Amino acid sequence: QLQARRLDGIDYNPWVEFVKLASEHDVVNLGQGFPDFPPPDFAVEAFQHAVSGDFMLNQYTKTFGYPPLTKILASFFGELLGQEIDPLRNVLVTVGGYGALFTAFQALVDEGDEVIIIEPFFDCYEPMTMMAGGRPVFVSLKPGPGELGSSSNWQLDPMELAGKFTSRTKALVLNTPNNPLGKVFSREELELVASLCQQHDVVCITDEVYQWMVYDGHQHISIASLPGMWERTLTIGSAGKTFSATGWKVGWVLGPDHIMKHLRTVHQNSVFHCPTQSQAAVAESFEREQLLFRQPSSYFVQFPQAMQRCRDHMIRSLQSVGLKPLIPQGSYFLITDISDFKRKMPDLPGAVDEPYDRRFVKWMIKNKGLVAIPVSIFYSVPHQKHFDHYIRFCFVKDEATLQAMDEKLRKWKVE
Amino acid sequence: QLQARRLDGIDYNPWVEFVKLASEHDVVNLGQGFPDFPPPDFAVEAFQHAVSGDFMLNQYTKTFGYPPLTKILASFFGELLGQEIDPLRNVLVTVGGYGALFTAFQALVDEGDEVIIIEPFFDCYEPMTMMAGGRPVFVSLKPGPGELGSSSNWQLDPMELAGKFTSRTKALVLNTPNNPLGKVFSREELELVASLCQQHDVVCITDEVYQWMVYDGHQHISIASLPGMWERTLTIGSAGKTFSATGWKVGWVLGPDHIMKHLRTVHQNSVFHCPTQSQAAVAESFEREQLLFRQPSSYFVQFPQAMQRCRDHMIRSLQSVGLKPLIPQGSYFLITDISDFKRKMPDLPGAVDEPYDRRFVKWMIKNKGLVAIPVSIFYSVPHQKHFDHYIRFCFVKDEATLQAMDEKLRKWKVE
Numbered sequence: 059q060l061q062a063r064r065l066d067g068i069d070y071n072p073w074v075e076f077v078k079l080a081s082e083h084d085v086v087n088l089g090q091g092f093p094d095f096p097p098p099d100f101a102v103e104a105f106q107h108a109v110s111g112d113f114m115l116n117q118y119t120k121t122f123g124y125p126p127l128t129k130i131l132a133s134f135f136g137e138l139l140g141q142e143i144d145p146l147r148n149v150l151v152t153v154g155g156y157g158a159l160f161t162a163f164q165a166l167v168d169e170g171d172e173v174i175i176i177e178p179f180f181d182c183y184e185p186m187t188m189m190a191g192g193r194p195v196f197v198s199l200k201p202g203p204g205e206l207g208s209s210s211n212w213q214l215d216p217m218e219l220a221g222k223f224t225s226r227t228k229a230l231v232l233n234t235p236n237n238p239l240g241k242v243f244s245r246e247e248l249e250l251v252a253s254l255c256q257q258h259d260v261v262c263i264t265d266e267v268y269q270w271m272v273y274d275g276h277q278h279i280s281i282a283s284l285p286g287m288w289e290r291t292l293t294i295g296s297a298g299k300t301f302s303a304t305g306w307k308v309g310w311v312l313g314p315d316h317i318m319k320h321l322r323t324v325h326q327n328s329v330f331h332c333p334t335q336s337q338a339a340v341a342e343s344f345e346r347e348q349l350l351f352r353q354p355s356s357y358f359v360q361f362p363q364a365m366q367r368c369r370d371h372m373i374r375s376l377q378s379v380g381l382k383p384l385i386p387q388g389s390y391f392l393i394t395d396i397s398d399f400k401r402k403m404p405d406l407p408g409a410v411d412e413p414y415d416r417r418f419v420k421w422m423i424k425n426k427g428l429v430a431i432p433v434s435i436f437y438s439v440p441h442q443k444h445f446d447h448y449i450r451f452c453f454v455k456d457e458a459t460l461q462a463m464d465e466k467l468r469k470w471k472v473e
Numbered sequence: 474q475l476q477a478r479r480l481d482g483i484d485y486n487p488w489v490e491f492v493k494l495a496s497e498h499d500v501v502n503l504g505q506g507f508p509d510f511p512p513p514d515f516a517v518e519a520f521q522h523a524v525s526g527d528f529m530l531n532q533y534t535k536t537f538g539y540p541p542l543t544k545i546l547a548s549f550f551g552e553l554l555g556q557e558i559d560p561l562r563n564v565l566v567t568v569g570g571y572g573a574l575f576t577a578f579q580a581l582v583d584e585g586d587e588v589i590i591i592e593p594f595f596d597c598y599e600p601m602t603m604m605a606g607g608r609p610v611f612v613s614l615k616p617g618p619g620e621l622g623s624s625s626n627w628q629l630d631p632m633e634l635a636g637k638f639t640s641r642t643k644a645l646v647l648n649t650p651n652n653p654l655g656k657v658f659s660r661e662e663l664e665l666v667a668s669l670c671q672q673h674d675v676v677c678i679t680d681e682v683y684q685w686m687v688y689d690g691h692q693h694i695s696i697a698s699l700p701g702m703w704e705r706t707l708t709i710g711s712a713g714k715t716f717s718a719t720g721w722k723v724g725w726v727l728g729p730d731h732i733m734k735h736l737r738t739v740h741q742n743s744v745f746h747c748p749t750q751s752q753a754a755v756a757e758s759f760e761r762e763q764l765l766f767r768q769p770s771s772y773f774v775q776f777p778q779a780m781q782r783c784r785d786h787m788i789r790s791l792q793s794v795g796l797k798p799l800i801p802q803g804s805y806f807l808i809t810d811i812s813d814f815k816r817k818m819p820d821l822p823g824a825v826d827e828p829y830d831r832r833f834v835k836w837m838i839k840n841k842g843l844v845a846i847p848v849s850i851f852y853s854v855p856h857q858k859h860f861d862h863y864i865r866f867c868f869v870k871d872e873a874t875l876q877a878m879d880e881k882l883r884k885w886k887v888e
């Protein structure tokens with residue numbers, strides 16, 4: 059009654075509980091979706107230049123983005139997407155990917171609109187939809203029939219997905235690479251989505267914040283580069299998962315002017331400007347990578363290699379303690395199946411109707427010194443029952459952290 | 474129909490037209506609401522430390538604010554307000570003042586709620602209200618009966634204001650010091666507001682971004698420090714008008730936990746984190762001013778003095794060319810009456826029903842080389858008729874700019 063009704067149902071963050079519990083224990087924190095090592099020098103220095111350079115960089119820049127930034131964005135991405143991008147009609151700099159999604163949702167979703175959300179989903183898609191009046195409609199990625207599983211096996215059933223589409227569908231949220239699962243969507247997959255999107259006349263909000271984090275030579279493809287798609291796609295990116303600098307909270311949406319004009323309205327009536335210097339830092343950082351694009355010394359070459367090693371490493375460590383990793387094709391993350399623990403250990407302490415994985419994560423923090431994340435926080439509540447056996451790990455960590463993980467794991471193992 | 478209805482009516486920015494026109498002319502730009510000189514060294518350096526220091530400052534900080542920042546905020550402001558402030562329940566770091574208002578509105582205002590907006594208003598109060606479903610209800614500050622006018626004479630009529638209050642009033646937006654007028658609200662004024670707010674049970678969203686910019690020894694008072702008010706006040710501030718670094722876009726709301734918990738919900742479903750380093754810069758900057766609070770070398774002492782000089786200077790320059798300045802008690806701004814021009818020059822070129830001051834500003838850009846802002850952009854459309862004779866100037870400028878103004882003014886004067 060004092061609060062607006064749009065807040066109904068979206069006030070609880072299941073995250074918190076656990077950060078609170080992790081901090082009152084000695085832990086290796088693998089629930090954190092960000093590096094614990096420095097960003098690349100070129101990028102840190104880029105920031106250092108922006109705050110040490112032309113003094114007017116401390117004052118306001120342009121509303122829809124700091125032009126050196128929109129410039130490089132439209133160029134580098136226009137090339138990557140295969141698309142002509144006007145910085146002033148097709149690019150909006152936002153407060154991180156979070157900002158971009160929020161802007162997108164507040165633009166497009168209205169009382170009654172349905173949004174198709176693919177499980178597992180980055181958790182904020184559902185609240186944002188709900189805050190905007192929309193109705194989330196869920197479809198589950200479904201793992202197909204080795205012990206080690208693979209992200210690319212998780213399947214978007216063409217009949218199931220076609221069925222979610224109604225006359226009320228405003229948008230489908232497609233996040234690739236997927237967090238938490240790590241799925242990198244295939245071309246044939248994308249096309250499935252593009253095709254139903256094209257058919258029912260529906261916007262594809264597409265969150266590609268993890269674009270650069272790809273492994274095993276799977277290749278990131280943007281639905282926006284598919285024939286006919288640019289006219290109905292909003293592509294989101296984030297400097298923070300680009301340059302391993304999450305704290306910079308700089309993101310953008312790329313999209314056709316007739317959609318963007320609304321994302322702009324929300325922007326000009328919400329935050330109006332993004333801060334200047336960080337934008338400057340990002341613009342420089344992109345210039346550096348575009349200059350060296352594909353080159354061996356380029357960050358987008360070295361980094362995915364480095365983190366693949368981290369992935370591989372974590373995958374082996376966790377494997378031998380009973381956890382059942384699903385190899386990810388990209389993202390900061392891997393999930394592991396814990397169903398073996400559920401059979402061996404069915405009755406762990408927690409609330410009635412609390413999903414197993416949350417109970418399990420809480421256990422492991424207390425006793426084994428390791429933080430992970432209950433995958434069920436990325437499912438519709440109706441679906442947490444059936445999907446209460448995964449946990450999510452972040453392998454974008456320092457060697458010293460992977461060592462500590464190993465220590466924790468070896469100590470646990472004697473059991 | 475593709476866009477959400479909340480965007481109805483809020484898509485047009487009357488600002489733009491003029492920036493476009495100013496850039497295709499040789500101008501002294503006094504429509505810009507920000508310095509064109511560097512921030513204080515301590516503050517620029519503070520940023521330089523934050524991006525050059527502990528590398529993990531590049532990663533995510535806490536959701537509701539970077540603790541060194543919420544810490545210093547709660548301390549410095551708790552002292553200034555006379556109030557006990559818990560950083561974690563009473564402070565939210567937002568993306569500038571703009572962010573804070575947006576968060577406040579999306580928290581509290583809902584289909585049907587009325588918001589009382591005092592004219593002239595910072596323009597974004599009306600769209601934000603409208604986007605949230607609310608109904609703006611306007612009351613006009615009204616200048617009381619020398620040639621030079623004064624901001625403090627503009628009056629909030631106690632009967633007029635009491636009359637705006639209905640059972641549907643959710644909030645009243647109080648902005649002091651006022652932009653554009655420069656009014657610094659008096660204690661007796663505040664109390665009027667507090668008292669009706671207290672009576673009808675209504676939140677006072679109070680925008681004090683200009684807190685530090687006060688002149689002639691008028692004193693900034695926060696409605697939040699009035700008896701009984703903290704329980705129904707949200708106070709907004711902005712690092713950018715604090716440290717003359719608008720481009721940093723760091724703001725905050727201070728307020729009682731039972732309100733803030735909703736501002737938090739919006740925050741955690743919109744931007745989630747504010748960027749770390751800038752927060753760090755601000756936290757340091759405040760530490761520096763709090764240490765030297767009231768001291769002669771403190772920025773909050775030196776700066777208002779400096780800008781008072783700039784004010785005084787501009788007031789005299791514009792005075793002698795026929796403009797009729799209203800001395801401001803604070804803010805970055807002064808408005809001048811242009812009714813003499815309207816009598817001398819009634820028929821200037823523009824759209825039918827375009828207010829005089831907009832037509833006039835456009836004229837002055839083209840012919841006299843000076844940018845200002847039509848005050849009518851800060852009135853309800855119904856009220857722009859009667860209030861089409863002011864323009865707004867920003868005197869927070871370098872000497873070299875005030876010189877250029879003078880050049881433009883002297884050249885004009887020969888006429």
Ligand SMILES: Cc1ncc(COP(=O)(O)O)c(CN)c1O
Nearest residue numbers: 154155156180237265267296298
């Ligand atoms: C899938 C996904 N999309 C969007 C975001 C938004 O993050 P940020 O605002 O820091 O860019 C995140 C969180 N990093 C994410 O993992």
Ligand SMILES: Cc1ncc(COP(=O)(O)O)c(CN)c1O
Nearest residue numbers: 569570571595652680682711713
């Ligand atoms: C009255 C008023 N309030 C709030 C704001 C918001 O500005 P910012 O977001 O940069 O803090 C402004 C613009 N400076 C303003 O003048």
